[PDB]
């Protein structure tokens, strides 16, 4: 078995290897990359996402989210308070202000220490889930707006034609902005490109050990657990690497820098934070190996978790028994 310790693997494809997206994902998995839950892909030196980022300041963040924490430094939840709209130029200025800017630090490890010590005492503002893309239409390789769709994958594998679309989302971050412990909708893959700015640090639990994280989460957030059998779908819970180690949860960590791709694999729980002002683009995708994970994916039916239009068909076809109750998530 490849990669039995479930290490995060880093790949350096050649420009020739960067042509066929599906083929390279399959290659990564042949080397055991999926066992970690997360992989890094460094693009060929000849590749670029677009020419420059000089003209992005007029993009609108219609609903910036202030991430307010509750709990203790290593075990907390966050809720998202809606703020007034602002442009990316305005957001960048805010990120760089004295109130919100990255503190002086020695290295990534020093900044990580500062994050877990002090995160809960601040409320950074995030521009998340903004439909759009910053890939040039002429970028032919690993263009996240030009991937094969999940709906076409399901049709190719299972022969059923379904409604729905999937398109990329942009994320504008600042120091301490946080993504909570989660797997993707329907335990899909995700791919994330860091277009510009400061790094993003990731934590990940191997898919074969996901239930260990779930059990700890139930212990650490007992009221939330009683409210919903899949409350990590709410994407609001944080657990520090120190607390994971104290409880024997297997995990790994890695820092993503501008110009690098990360791929998360089916049922790979992940969480993380941004180092400073940055912009990332991400989208979900599927492969034939995903189908069995989609069939088994937990669902939130308490009504808290966000439901995309396109997830309906996934639940309807892959989980027909759960569909009525999940669809009771409704409204």
Ligand X SMILES: NC(=S)Nc1ccccc1
Ligand Y SMILES: O=C(O)CNC(=O)C(=O)O
In the complex, the residues that contact Ni ion under the rule CB under 5 A are 190
Residue 171 binds what, of ligand Y, Ni ion, ligand X, none (CB under 5 to 8 Å, by partner type)? ligand Y
Considering the complex, state which of residue 306 and residue 328 has its C-beta at the smaller distance from ligand Y: 306
DSSP string of 208-245?
Answer: GGHHHHHHHHHHHSHHHHHH-TTGGGG--EEE-HHHHH
Contact 78, 67 (CB under 8 A): yes
53 is in an annotated binding site: no
Q: Does 300 bind Zn ion (CB under 5 A)?
A: yes
108 three-state secondary structure: helix
User: What does R_g of the chain's alpha carbons equal in angstroms?
Assistant: 19
- Pick from 19, 57, 70, 242 the residue near ligand X by CB under 6 A: 242
**Both tokens assigned to 50:** 């677009």
Q: Does 152 bind ligand X (CB under 6 A)?
A: yes
Residue 204: closest CA among 255, 151, 137, 139? 255
For residue 41, list its beta bridge partners: 11, 261
- Pick from 73, 162, 302, 317 the residue near Zn ion by CB under 5 A: 302
Which runs of E-coded beta strand occur in 73-156? 75-82, 86-87, 125-131
User: What is the rounded CA–CA span in Å between residue 287 and residue 5?
Assistant: 23
Number of neighbours of residue 131 by Cβ within 10 angstroms: 8
Residue 25 binds what, of ligand X, Zn ion, Ni ion, none (CB under 5 to 8 Å, by partner type)? ligand X
Residue 116 binds what, of ligand Y, Zn ion, ligand X, none (CB under 5 to 8 Å, by partner type)? ligand X
Considering the complex, state which of residue 86 and residue 180 has its C-beta at the smaller distance from Ni ion: 180
- Pick from 14, 15, 22, 246 the residue near ligand X by CB under 6 A: 22
Q: Does 188 bind ligand X (CB under 6 A)?
A: no
327 is in an annotated binding site: no
Q: Does 154 bind Zn ion (CB under 5 A)?
A: no
Q: Which stretch binds Zn ion (CB under 5 A): 60-68, 169-177, 184-192, 292-300?
A: 292-300
**Both tokens assigned to 127:** 């521009």
User: What is the rounded CA–CA span in Å between residue 9 and residue 36?
Assistant: 8
Considering the complex, state which of residue 6 and residue 180 has its C-beta at the smaller distance from Ni ion: 180
How far apart are CB 304 and Zn ion at their closest, in Å? 4
Q: Which residues bind ligand X (CB under 6 A)?
A: 9-11, 21-22, 25-26, 31, 73-74, 112-113, 116-117, 148-149, 152-153, 240-242, 285-287
Residues marked as binding for 2-oxoglutarate? 126, 192, 200, 235
């Amino acid at each position: 078995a490849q990669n039995p310790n479930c290490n995060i693997m880093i790949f350096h494809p050649t420009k020739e290897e960067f042509n066929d997206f599906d083929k390279y994902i399959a290659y990564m998995e042949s080397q055991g990359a999926h066992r970690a839950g997360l992989a890094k892909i460094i693009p060929p030196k000849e590749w670029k996402a677009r020419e420059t980022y000089d003209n992005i300041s007029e993009i609108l963040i219609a609903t910036p989210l202030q991430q307010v924490a509750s709990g203790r430094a290593g075990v907390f939840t966050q809720y998202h308070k809606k703020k007034k709209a602002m442009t990316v130029g305005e957001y960048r200025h805010l990120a760089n202000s004295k109130k919100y800017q990255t503190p002086p630090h020695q290295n990534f490890e020093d900044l990580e220490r500062k994050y877990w010590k002090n995160r809960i005492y601040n409320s950074p503002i995030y521009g998340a889930d903004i439909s759009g893309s910053l890939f040039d239409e002429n970028t032919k390789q690993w263009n996240l707006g030009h991937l094969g769709t999940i709906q076409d994958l399901l049709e190719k594998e299972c022969g059923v034609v379904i409604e729905g679309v999937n398109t990329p989302y942009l994320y504008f971050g600042m120091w301490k902005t946080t993504f909570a412990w989660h797997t993707e909708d329907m335990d899909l893959y995700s791919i994330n490109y860091l277009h510009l700015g400061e790094p993003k640090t990731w934590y990940v639990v191997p898919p074969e050990h996901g239930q260990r994280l779930e059990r700890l989460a139930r212990e650490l957030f007992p009221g939330s657990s009683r409210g919903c059998g899949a409350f990590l779908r709410h994407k609001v819970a944080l657990i520090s690497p120190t607390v994971l180690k104290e409880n024997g949860i297997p995990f790994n960590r890695i820092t993503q820098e501008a110009g690098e791709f990360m791929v998360t694999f089916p049922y790979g729980y992940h969480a993380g934070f941004n180092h400073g002002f940055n912009c990332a683009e991400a989208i979900n995708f599927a492969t034939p190996r995903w189908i069995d994970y989609g069939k088994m994916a937990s669902q939130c039916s308490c009504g808290e978790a966000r439901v995309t239009f396109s997830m309906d068909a996934f639940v309807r076809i892959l989980q027909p028994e759960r569909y009525d109750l999940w669809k009771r998530g409704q409204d």
